[PDB]
């Protein structure tokens, strides 16, 4: 009871000190204030966070089995990010990018770096540099399993004595962070992968890089696709759930949901209706959706509708989830 609560908080502090910010942490904390943090367009993965975004001057991984919709966040990240006077830098090594969709997101294109490395090395040097330069306030790196090494894709081996695309990233990742942090730049990088089994075995290790990128990321994001949507045709959208399996910035293990339409992507408005009724500020009267008196209409695309009609009442129920979690 007394020297013991004494002794730990004390200890803990021994070592945030010589162990970056917060190296420990009870996850139940209420967290300061990284000021600096990017909206991820999704308020549910905002608030996941814990700082309501991503914590700006870090690199951030996003990794999840395709058609998820990691991209989606990445775009946003940088719709966001960019909205506010931010200049951003798209490092494709995918060549698999959709502006007719990146521009229905909030991304300047026109004004989006976007540059298209021929081999590893040289898409992690550009970065680099790319950033040294203080300009840039967000990078993707697209593809993580791209980054092949000059060797590979040179003939010579695809492996024969290496560790290389591990060695690589391991070796960039290190003197990529530091910079990172100093030029206050958060740094994107997708993950490529194939889903579970009900229980998680697969390759928690890497496609031979992101085995670093694990250490190095301060956050690092699980998306995976959860479920496919219809009203009455067949179907506008995926819902996707993200899991924040690490995070260095506020307590990790939180979760986030969220409605991502074959259209606009994330879906602001429905995002709302959810977190709506599981903060109590709408109700259901059967399927019914009502913001105290006015109901909204049954059925959340119904109220989605509603709700994408007038910003008014929309913008209130936003007011309001975020007072009441700051």
């Known amino acids: 009871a007394p020297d013991r609560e004494k002794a730990l908080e004390l200890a803990m502090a021994q070592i945030d000190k010589n162990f970056g910010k917060g190296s420990v942490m009870r996850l139940g904390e209420e967290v300061r204030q990284p000021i600096s943090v990017i909206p991820t ?17 870090r690199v951030i991984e996003i990794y999840g089995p395709e058609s998820s919709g990691k991209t989606t ?36 294109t026109d004004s989006l770096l976007v540059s298209q490395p021929d081999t590893g090395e040289q898409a992690l040097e550009i970065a680099d540099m790319l950033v040294r330069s203080g300009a840039l306030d967000i990078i993707v790196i697209d593809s993580v399993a791209a980054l092949v090494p000059r060797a590979e894709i040179e003939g010579e ?19 990529m962070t530091g910079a990172l942090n100093n030029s206050g730049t958060t740094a994107i990088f997708i993950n490529q992968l194939r889903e579970k089994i009900g229980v998680m075995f697969g390759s928690p290790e890497t496609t031979t890089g992101g085995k670093a990128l694990k250490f190095y990321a301060s956050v690092r994001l699980d998306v ?16 996707t759930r993200v899991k924040v399996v690490k995070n260095k910035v506020s307590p990790p293990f939180k979760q986030a949901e969220f409605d991502i ?6 879906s602001r408005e429905g995002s709302l209706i959810d977190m709506g009724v599981e903060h109590g500020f709408i109700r259901k009267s059967g399927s ?3 913001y105290e008196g006015e109901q909204l ?21 936003e007011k309001k989830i975020k007072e009441k979690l700051g």
């Open 41 to 57: 367009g999704s308020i549910s993965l905002d608030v996941a966070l814990g700082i309501g975004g991503l914590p700006r001057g």
């Open 288 to 290: 019914w959706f009502t």
């Open 224 to 239: 995976r696709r959860i479920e496919t949507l219809k009203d009455g045709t067949d179907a506008v959208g995926n819902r």
């Open 261 to 266: 339409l074959y259209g606009q992507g994330i």
């Open 297 to 317: 209409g049954q059925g959340k695309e119904n109220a989605r509708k509603f709700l994408l009609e007038n910003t008014d009442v929309a913008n209130e129920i």
């Open 157 to 175: 081996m695809g492996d024969s004595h290496v560790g290389l695309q591990a060695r690589l990233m391991s070796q960039a990742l290190r003197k």
């Open 73 to 108: 966040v990445a775009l946003h990240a940088v719709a966001n990010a960019q909205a506010a006077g931010g200049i951003a830098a798209f490092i494709d090594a995918e060549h698999a990018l959709d502006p007719e969709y990146a521009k229905k997101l909030g991304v300047d």
